[PDB]
């Protein structure tokens, strides 16, 4: 069956659950290199 | 003048489509085309993302 299925704006909001837990992942590494940074400073 | 008047009602494609899929079970024009799987789909490399 040629079918005509898509997606809906849960799964277009399941893809911003993956893209803000990224962007904020590496926001928290920051702190990371920072916050050992000043543990050797 | 009974059977043709059945035609023309349309009554015989009712008659005819009842006893051909109630006794199926199986699903017709399940095939159709191959044109949605003219590229690769996700299942035929999906072993690379996992």
Redesign the interface.
Known sequence: ???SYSYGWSFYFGALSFIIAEMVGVLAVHMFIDRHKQLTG | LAVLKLSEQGVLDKLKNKWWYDKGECGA?????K??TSALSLSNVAGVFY
């Open positions: 069956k040629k079918n | 024009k399940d095939s159709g085309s044109e949605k």
